[PDB]
Amino acid sequence: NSFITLNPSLPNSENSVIEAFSYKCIHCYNHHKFGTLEKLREAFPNLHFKLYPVSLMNGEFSKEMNELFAFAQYKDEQNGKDASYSDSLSHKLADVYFVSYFLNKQRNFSNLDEFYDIGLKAMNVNKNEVLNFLNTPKAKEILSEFQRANDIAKTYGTPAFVVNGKYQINPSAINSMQDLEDLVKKLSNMK
């Protein structure tokens, strides 16, 4: 089948596409470079777009990567943007780690401060702003939602696209931008 139905459906996912991704996943990188989410916004300007990092795939600093993406989600939403914008914090944050891993072939980060600072500088924020955010109820809610990314990723791998929190697309059904546009229009308009 071209998609499966999630049960239960995801919270805070009405009128949306969520991409579960890993910064070590070359197909994720390809969608990032290609601008898949920006192009989906172009075709579906009514939808919201969110990245779900898959912590089981993100290595030594996987918990801290989730912290930085949760912050980026919160800040982008505050600013009326989301991950389908090239200037968003979420997109900038994904870019710096994709570049680190795939184009600078950085196997590891020396230590946690070095890892964190790469994300802090990509988002042009200081550590105090992120750590203060992590003590708030909204941070715990956002991180709690990311927990589902691992189970979502086990079905078919990454990236996993999920429409309206309910319909998870089988990657074998996607062979072009047009295919993915067609499935999002079909699935976005079901119950």
Author numbering: 4 to 194
Lines quoted from the article behind this entry:
The bacterial proteins of the Dsb family catalyze the formation of disulfide bridges between cysteine residues that stabilize protein structures and ensure their proper functioning. The oxidative part of this network consists of two monomeric DsbAs (DsbA1 and DsbA2) related to EcDsbL, which cooperate with one DsbB. The solved structures of both CjDsbAs, especially the length and amino acid sequences of their L2 and L3 loops that are essential elements of the monomeric thiol oxidoreductases, were different from that of EcDsbA but similar, though not identical, to that of EcDsbL, which affected their functioning.
CjDsbA1 crystallized in the C2 and P212121 space group containing two monomers in the ASU for the monoclinic form and one molecule per ASU for the orthorhombic form, while CjDsbA2 crystallized in P3221 with a single chain in the ASU. In the monoclinic CjDsbA1, the C-terminal HisTag as well as 3–4 N-terminal residues could not be modelled, and in chain B, two residues (108–109) on the surface could not be modelled. The superposition of monoclinic and orthorhombic forms of CjDsbA1 showed relatively small differences between them, which was confirmed by an RMSD value of 0.45 Å. The active site of CjDsbA1 was observed in the reduced form, while the CjDsbA2 formed a clear disulfide bond. This was due to differences in protein purification procedures. CjDsbA1 was purified under reducing conditions. It should be noted that the CjDsbA1 redox potential was the highest among the characterized DsbAs so far described; EcDsbL has a redox potential of −95 mV and N. meningitidis lipoprotein NmDsbA2 has a redox potential of −79 mV. Previously, we found that CjDsbA1 present in wild-type (wt) cells was present in its oxidized form, but it was mainly present in its reduced form in cells lacking CjDsbB; also, the lack of CjDsbA2 had no impact on its redox state. We documented that CjDsbA1 complemented the lack of the EcDsbA in the motility test, in contrast to CjDsbA2, which was inactive in this assay. First of all, in E. coli JCB817, CjDsbA1 formed higher molecular weight oligomeric complexes (~46 kDa), which disappeared when cells were treated with the reducing agent DTT; in E. coli JCB818 lacking EcDsbB, these complexes migrated slower when compared to their mobility in E. coli JCB817.
